[PDB]
């Protein structure tokens, strides 16, 4: 039972890539650059 | 809390653009039509029915009530 060593390694690399990708989804303080213009 | 994430969604720009264009165009001819109808109704609206005078034969368009129909 348990992962094979290759399974362990692939899971580790995949999970590190996934965490990096997910961390890249966060928004910077200026990220929503809104263009302003109006006309009891 | 600074935990704002990116919401992946399809491009809604074209849908809003089409809706804006269609509304603009319908409104462009639509508003004038409504204003003209209101003015006609208020100022010149509704010809009242009356008995036909003897010796007078009316025109084909004088048998209708609403001025726009006439
Ligand atoms: C997607 C969409 C695609 C759109 C495609 C284009 C549209 C195609 C169809 C267009 C057809 C239009 C048409 O044929 O109109 C028919 C019809 C034409 O009228 P008519 O048969 O020539 O005249 C009838 C009489 O012979 C004569 O009546 P009258 O002379 O006694 O009436 C007075 C006069 C004027 O009356 C008044 O001004 C006063 C009436 C209320 C007065 C209330 C008191 C006010 C004073 C008090 C406040 C100020 C003073 C006090 C202030 C101090 C207060 C303390 O009436 C009007 O002006 C009605 C105006 C109707 C405008 C129609 C515009 C059509 C536009 C077509 C294109 C539309 C495109 C969309 C954009 C449209 C624009 C946004 O108009 C209507 O049917 C209007 C309907 C009103 C409904 C009232 C509420 C009914 C609710 C029932 C349901 C409730 C349960 C749910």
**3 state DSSP class of A27:** coil
Where does residue B45 rank: exposed (0-12), middle (13-18), buried (19+ CB within 10 A)?
Answer: middle
What single-letter DSSP state applies at residue B61?
G
Compute, in angstroms, the gap from residue A26 CA to the centroid of ligand 1: 52
Measured in angstroms, the resolution is: 3.1
Q: What are phi and psi of B15, to 5 degrees?
A: -65, -45
In this structure, what token pair is assigned to residue A29? 């303080």
Method: cryo-EM
- Chain A residue numbers with beta carbons less than 8 Å from the beta carbon of B3 are 26
**3 state DSSP class of B66:** coil
Q: How far is A20 from chain B, CA to nearest CA, in Å?
A: 14
Find the length of chain A: 40
Ligand 1 pocket member B26 (CB < 6 A): yes
Compute, in angstroms, the gap from residue B35 CA to the centroid of ligand 1: 10
CA B24/CA B31 separation, integer angstroms: 10
In this structure, what token pair is assigned to residue A10? 């692939």
Rama region for A14: left / alpha / beta (φ>0; ψ in -120 to 50; rest):
alpha
CA B31/CA A5 separation, integer angstroms: 73
């Amino acid at each position: 039972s348990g992962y094979t060593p290759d399974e362990k390694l692939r899971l580790q690399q995949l999970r590190e890539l996934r965490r990096r990708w997910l961390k890249d989804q966060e928004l910077s303080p200026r990220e929503p650059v809104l263009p302003p213009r109006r006309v009891t | 809390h600074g935990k704002r994430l990116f919401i992946i969604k399809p491009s809604g720009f074209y849908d809003r653009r089409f809706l804006k264009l269609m509304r603009f165009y319908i409104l462009l001819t639509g508003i004038p039509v409504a204003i003209g109808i209101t003015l006609v109704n208020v100022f010149i609206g509704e010809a009242e029915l009356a008995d036909i005078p003897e010796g007078y034969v009316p025109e084909h368009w004088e048998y209708f009530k609403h001025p726009i129909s006439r």
